[PDB]
């Protein structure tokens, strides 16, 4: 495919503005429909989600409308993605090749913690990704992926308006036929508002929740929440003087203590392309996996910044998640002007391991234009108490939030999204064929799994982040304890057998294994003894033993009752294939290398020989996978032979469950 640079010369043909070249990509047009079946209020990942998975469903269905304020796709913190999400975006045909083009590869999930009273020892938990040749896990910049998945739903029927917001005020939402009225203009300045006529509303506002705050109060939680401050730096060539041993920067790595943890994220960054620019190296991309091109044939990531003339540079993403009860100096000005700096740098200095591990980066000054240098958000966790009503529904973030920690906001997130797409297909054609009041009734009660669902999801989720915290606090209990169970109970099983049809269904299944009984067991117990000793006090030694017997006790009943295969030994460095901890034990699959040229992280497999980052040509051997326990030609060949494409849909197989098999 010869690349073509229509929007660029597009926007400069017409003296563009961003929202306006971006809405000149709309199926039906840039100005605004007068009728829509859906408007979904908001295009962050999840109204754009919702939107591909409604239309990917069952297409030529329903028309949609996405209304997003922002002129070009916004910053959003929330980067990494897990195997769910990749497999999602495989499913709607857009493969590893193409999307490590865009994102960063992300290889495992890290965790070192931390001994406030012993300052320098630390333990670590380390878990391994995927084969090349299996799948990917995504690094992703958020102003990316929103444009990916704009330009994606736009070529396929879906019309996504940038620049547009929706007036709560006026909007007006029913149970009708066609009983939504909905006004969007580009502002609360704007004297001449559109209205579009529909039958279903999407609340996709995320955590401003600006639909359903009209509808109920949002809820908290009891008990201590988090805070969050964050700022974006270097990403070092070099990771070699990390003071983690063994550290690798392709995965989501995770420095963990008593107050909280930090994040680390390495990512490539597309900040100050042009957005036109960028429409044209997306639509090429596209074009290209429709095609086929094989990844070495493909323009690394640096050519295509060449080819469309763009900016890109790797940056690492690193942001504090600590309890809202820690208490701090009533003086912080020597670390900084700002609280998110200065809480930032203070919590930074009070650990000589994080202080030497920042040490290796530098700050980036206003990534995301002015005033962007430190992030701060306060009391991250709430929930919605009513997500779906006469006319509307929400998803995503609008449901509700816990926590960065293990990344359910996208990869959780996305089973609310895509459930509420394939139930707007029936919504609104109960809503064409039925009178209003039997509409309405059976809306409701088509919806009450639904909002079930929601109401149970948050809860579970933040137990699961208040078992990590409180196990975070001993350097026994987080890897033994809180890692060990999250990823027992929380890796998706038979996520090979998805596809469009099954994946919502499955997605709801999963909730990173939260709801599996013995891991709820477990979280109660270390909770209710934990959160009795104050967080200034080390945890006596006698709690740990009692918490790590008891829960070792629970694991071997339930890892002996899980019928399903896996090479535990090498995916999990510290554990045996029984899931027994293994004091010393090093060895793990190999999936992933550094490119000597430029640093990015690359996964192994024989048919890329070249960096899709720079294009480096790197050594025919440096492609092989080491399997650890070894793999035969022919078990390797089996593996990979279930990876290739999705199952086409039975509607008579079972769905088989992503959590462990249950004792019977
Ligand atoms: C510190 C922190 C770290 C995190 N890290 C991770 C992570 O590593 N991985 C992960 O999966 N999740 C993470 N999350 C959670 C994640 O950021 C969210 O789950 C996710 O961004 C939710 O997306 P959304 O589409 O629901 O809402 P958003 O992405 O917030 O989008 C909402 C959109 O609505 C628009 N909007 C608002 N009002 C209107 C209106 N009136 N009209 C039109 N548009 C409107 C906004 O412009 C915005 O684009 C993190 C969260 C925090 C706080
Ligand atoms: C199941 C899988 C999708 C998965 N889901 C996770 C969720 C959270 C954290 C880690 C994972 C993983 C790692 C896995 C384990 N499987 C061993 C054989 C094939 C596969 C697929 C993949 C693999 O190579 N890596
Ligand atoms: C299990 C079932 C009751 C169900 N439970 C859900 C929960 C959330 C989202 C969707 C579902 C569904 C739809 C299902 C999926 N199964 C495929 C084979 C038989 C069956 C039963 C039925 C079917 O035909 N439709
Ligand atoms: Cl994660
Ligand atoms: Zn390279």
Known sequence: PTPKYTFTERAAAGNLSDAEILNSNNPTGSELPDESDVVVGGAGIHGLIYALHASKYKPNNLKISVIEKNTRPGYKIGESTLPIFYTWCKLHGISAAYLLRLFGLKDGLCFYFLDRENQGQYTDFCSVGAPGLVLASLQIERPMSELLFTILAQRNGVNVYHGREVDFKSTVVQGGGQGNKIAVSRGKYDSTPKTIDSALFVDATGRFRQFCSKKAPRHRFDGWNCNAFWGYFTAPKDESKIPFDLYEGDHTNHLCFPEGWVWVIRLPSWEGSPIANLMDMVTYILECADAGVPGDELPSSEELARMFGLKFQWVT???????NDVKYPEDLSAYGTREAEQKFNYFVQKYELLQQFMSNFELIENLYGPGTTWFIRKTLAYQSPVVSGPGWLAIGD????????YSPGINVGMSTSTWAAQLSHPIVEIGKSAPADA???????????????CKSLVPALEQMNRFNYVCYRDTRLGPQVACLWQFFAGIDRYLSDVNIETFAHYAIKWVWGAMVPEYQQVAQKC???????????????????????FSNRIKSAAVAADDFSLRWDAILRSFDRSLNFVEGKT???????????????????????KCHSCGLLGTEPQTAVTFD???????????????????????????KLPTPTRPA
């Open 629 to 655: 326990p070894p793999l035969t030609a022919e078990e390797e060949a089996l593996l990979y032979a279930a990876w290739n494409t999705a199952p086409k849909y039975d509607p008579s197989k079972e769905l």
């Open 527 to 549: 909770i209710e003894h934990i959160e009795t000793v104050p967080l200034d006090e080390r945890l006596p030694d006698a709690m740990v033993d009692e918490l790590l017997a």
């Open 587 to 609: 060895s793990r699959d190999i999936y992933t290398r550094q490119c000597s040229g430029c640093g990015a992280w690359l996964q192994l497999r024989p048919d890329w020989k």
């Open 439 to 453: 509409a309405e009734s059976s809306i409701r009660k088509l919806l009450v799994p639904y909002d079930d669902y």
């Open 398 to 405: 609008a449901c509700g939030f816990t926590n960065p920690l």
């Open 317 to 323: 993403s690193i942001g504090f998640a600590v309890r």
